[model samples]
Target: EKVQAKGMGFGGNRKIGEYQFGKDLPLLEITRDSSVEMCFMENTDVKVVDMGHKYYSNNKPMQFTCKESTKTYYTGYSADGYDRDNGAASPTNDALYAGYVIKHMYHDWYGVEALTKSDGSPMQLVMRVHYGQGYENAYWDGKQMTFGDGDTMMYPLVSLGVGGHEVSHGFTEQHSGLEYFGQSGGMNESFSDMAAQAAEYYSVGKNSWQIGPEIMKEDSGYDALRYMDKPSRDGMSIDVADDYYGGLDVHYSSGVYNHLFYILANQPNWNLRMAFDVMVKANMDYWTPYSTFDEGGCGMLSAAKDLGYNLDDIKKSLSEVTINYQSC
Candidate 1:
């Protein structure tokens, strides 16, 4: 039997502001997988289990563990000092945020099967928060995603954008297998950033166009890690393909495509949803491990055409970013 439940929790960074973080969690669907009962948000791979009075999601490959809070929750179950409605910036919040973001990807895109393993089985992803003492970064180690507690420079790196970005890396690795270096590496990072925006918009109905804004501290003098609208605004990313050089950092090289994506999503008669569809198709069906800027542009054009989008408009956006693509 399946049980539907509800709970309130942070979807983004609570430290940033209540309006951004405080919200009703997606409905959780608890099911009995044989004798072991499992709880997870509806239409998502995240699994939660109750252990004694403390809740934990310890399924193989897709675990969300918190060193700070021993007690996690599904929806109804709660422990003392752990109120779902007024939860702090702990690993619990990170787990919930990760669930929402991952669910958005699964629900909005092709489906859960689109994120399956190579053998056509469900994929398992682990999210580890409070990774290390005073840890200041988040990463995907080709297996699971790890988040740091963060120091003075930033807050906990578990916001929607950060989570979405890291999770998308896993997606790329499974599908496109884009190498993590050179132009292909840039495309890999850019695809993750694009998915970050897609996940944010799907969850909250809007986006700030800045990745990881919630993670940045005001005193850090950095608004966000990367700006999609104008990548150069961050002083490290480049906006046009012409500015990119060999051996550029993947994060900075990603700007060329990020800017193109921004322009494409904002084009007349086009929305982020449509743009994201093209991006997903391009990455999954057209892009290869060693695809270059021109090749990637052609893939986007092909994806747009396959999705029945206007070719002229896509070409215009690509041109805006100084990327040239021939008709495929």
Candidate 2:
């Protein structure tokens, strides 16, 4: 009903103000259905009021103003979720396009849409863009999403894959409360990757089974930022279960499960959506905060069983990737 006013800095002088709290994002504009309020506020001001419909938040100013307010989004055009980029894939203006990606994922992805808070409330996430803070990266800051511009090694870190990752980080926090340090940390990263890849698949009809490809500047020698089929191909990811360590590089360590999911989901009878649902069940219902890889594995099996999927088949698929409940 009410929202806190924490003017948190994202970038470009933009701040994510906490709010009381959209849908498919095509429904960005709000509906003024109150007769009394409509009469009192006929022509005062126009903005998309966040009423938590489809999980809307009053994230202060959702549109970008940059340092150029004169040409920034006006009061009339606010809440439209439109920008100059027009949903192109260019590095210079992929910020709002990134928002579109996130919205699609939130409504379309099984894992994200199935997320319910501790109170069984629908999850509403805030997104902040234009994070040109001299570095290239994106992260979920416990409350909202923060995206960054890129330098050389990477392109601007704004795309479907990256946005999905950031938003799914919020999902992981809200549902599983996965600790962001060790084995749980690696599982957290893997969830983001899986969600991001699913978003890519849903949007474009074909994702290269890789993450962060759009953000990579050069692909001649360096392929995607993280490869699901072969994680070690990036020289940073670990594909084998034995290479995993609970403490150490969580991002790199995420590759073990990433590759495992890739292998299992790519099979003929299985699908990405099914895998995602199983993962959601595992994370939200079965696994704990400090769950290890083995625990996660068992949870997946349990989820499959709950969903009426064959347990022996699921185990066989995971075992093919050496992702049993013991080693991986």
Candidate 3:
């Protein structure tokens, strides 16, 4: 077997080369774990670890001293989240948090199984925290995940929900290929919100329809970044299907379906797993390239049917919110 491992090979700090291993080698359990601070989970509970450099820069928009850490050379590892701290003081805390969240998502949500990349190689993603000079945001750029320290009005954007929201973008690119900026774009954002909520609930014992409320300076107030149960509560998002969806920003427009899921999934003893399963089916098996809100609503119903859930139960749930899912 041939193995390529990259590190500070005495040649340089960020150079990557190759190496070979024996052809007859048995796979074994390896613990390459390390630690970082989460500042806090049901909503906060995890460990932190170490320092390193990388072979290249993370391809993001802003300017930041910390770049992607190419520490994983297994070429067969999930890179799971290694705890890295801030400054020399290197490796941001958010990176560790993202790793932890993604680990749970991969198991509880993504189903812990060996996944191959486009080239038939083990697939993995790099995560970088302390993303920029300082902005209250986080994003997944179709490749890796980046987390930004929020502004004065917010906490760092590296909570479970935030991490799940960003990574869901990658999942969308891999599965449904939802285009950004149109009705599909709205669907794209909605998918992220769905996964984000799932992350929140999984981390803690509680979940909320509000996204990033943990990162907000205001707590327990109606001041979350976005509201799923009542999108209109945020003032920018609409809660019902309408002709004006095409004209609104995708994040704002995503409210229609976000509210729909809230209405359908919000029941006694109902869990995030149920909603996530239905969403996974709809997004992967039912959605088309240009699927609209109406189409997406029907897709949910169809996905529920395939899962053997009662059609009337879902229909009654949708109807309880006064939403129309009959057209699609």
Candidate 4:
């Protein structure tokens, strides 16, 4: 028997305040390959498993067991079917979606063997969904990905795009180790956003160019947290290198490179996969933790050249963002 169950996924183009809450949305099929198990309980109180393989359900902790060729079980909050109102917010869907994101990163971008910690040990990807009461953000704290339940203005922060962004931070931590202070910090943030877009494209076959759209509430007055094509439209991020300052927030400072990536990926004969290759090559082989904006730009050029792409076209995209690194 195939160990599989269907649950609601964060449909990429879902809009807030619309009467169509779950119309025309496809359900996500959670299978054994997702490496996640669901636990259901009757009561309202919930106990979550942390950093271990053990889980709790029905007021008792139980060992997680996945038997191969013996039994088939389905577990979740709803018996009829999982949906956005009930099932998507549950821990099972959160884990399933996060696992799907990381699986894409492992298989599509970096292999499982390449995902390691600073100490060179293999890293175990863990997700702590339902982190705090009404917390409205997600982060990767050098170990695991922690997501928060959103306040009234947002939904749960477990969308695939958000998961892709946060989990890419783990990749950055292990590979470039970019400092979270100035130019390096901006580069780090931009890389995460770029990877998020690539992951979304690979998983869903579409590049929305918007991040965190699935988490925004109806009254939030925002479609997404950031826009890759035009970052300054958010009223906080800067889309040109000339707009950068020493003390700007990393999220805001990341706009220039995000714009650069968007331009490069959309270029005539270029695509997201090619641009993602340049990004991975630059961070993994060329850039250092202290690489500045200009140095990062030059690293990208080097990566593009090494990948057998046209250097002049890459330079045009870089210069469009005021990242002229030809002198480097």
Predicted model with the maximum TM-score: 1
For each candidate in the order shown, give its overall lDDT on alpha carbons. Answer: 0.68, 0.57, 0.56, 0.65
Give lDDT tens digits, candidate 4, residues 139-237: 888766676666776776666678778888877777777888798999999988897887677665777797777778856787688999999989999
The digit string of per-residue lDDT tens for model 1 on 191-269 reads 8898888877877688879888777776787778899999999888999989988969999999999999899999998
**Candidate 1 global CA lDDT score:** 0.68
**Higher-ranked by lDDT: 2 or 4:** 4
> Model 3 TM-score?
0.68
Writing each residue's lDDT as its tens digit, candidate 2 over 1-328 gives 1111111111110111111111221111222222221110011111112111123344554322211111221111222223222122222123333444555555565434523456776544444544544346777776666655555565546566787788777777777778887777888899889988777767556676888766665532554778888888888778866777656588888887788788778766878877777887787778778987777888888888888866666776667656667543
TM-score of candidate 2 to 2 decimals: 0.70
Off by over 4 Å in 2: 1-59, 62-118, 219-221, 326-328
- Which has the higher lDDT value, candidate number 1 or candidate number 3? 1
Model 2 C-alpha lDDT versus the unseen true structure: 0.57
TM-score of each model, in listed order: 0.81, 0.70, 0.68, 0.78
**67-118 in candidate 3: lDDT tens per residue?**
1333422211122222222211112333343455555565666564112257
Candidate 4: clashing pairs of residues: none
Q: How many residue pairs clash per model?
A: 0, 2, 15, 0
